[PDB]
Amino acid sequence: GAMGSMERASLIQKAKLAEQAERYEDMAAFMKGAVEKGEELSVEERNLLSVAYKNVVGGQRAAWRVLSSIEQKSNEEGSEEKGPEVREYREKVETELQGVCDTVLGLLDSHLIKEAGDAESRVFYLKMKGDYYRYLAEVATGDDKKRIIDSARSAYQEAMDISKKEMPPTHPIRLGLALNFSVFHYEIANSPEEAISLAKTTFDEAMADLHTLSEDSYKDSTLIMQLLRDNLTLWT
């Protein structure tokens, strides 16, 4: 693509630089370029990929929620008619967001997922697939909302099934996947109970496996366990 002429290692090197420079769009473009080299991603590389896009889409999502909240406010009784602009700009942001999601989903589908045979890669990618469908779900309001949601669900579930089978309960990816899946339950699938049960169970099973971990791995897991806890605290 755009990055077809750059060396894979250069793209990775530049993804790391863009990250240091907080240039996440660049980062994501370099990583997409790297993915498009056709070689599987190492752990660090998938991490770069995830981070790049998570940041990109995280900015679009945040912007989308700003605009969406503005838009809903302009749809309140007594709100002055402001014209199409808010909806238009929300749509513009939303379209670009969806385009990022589609891009990521497209990378996962061509061909990260099919080539991801280790649980750590496969679960990582499915988690990401769940995430990006969830971000699509966040803005989805049409007749595909259900399908988008269940694509998120299905990718999360497959990732949960493998991670449960193949990863220790404390695995950061397992924990992160559960955290997100639980958030999906909570705010996408309108299943706060499942969200809470998932976050609780995940947290508790991680707790019980902390003992097997070195100090470095301990610190990785508890970091995500804390996010589970933050959500449990928020939600209960």
Partner: peptide, 6 residues
């Protein structure tokens, strides 16, 4: 106060 995801 925003739920966490990772």
């Amino acid at each position: 106060k925003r739920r966490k995801s990772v």
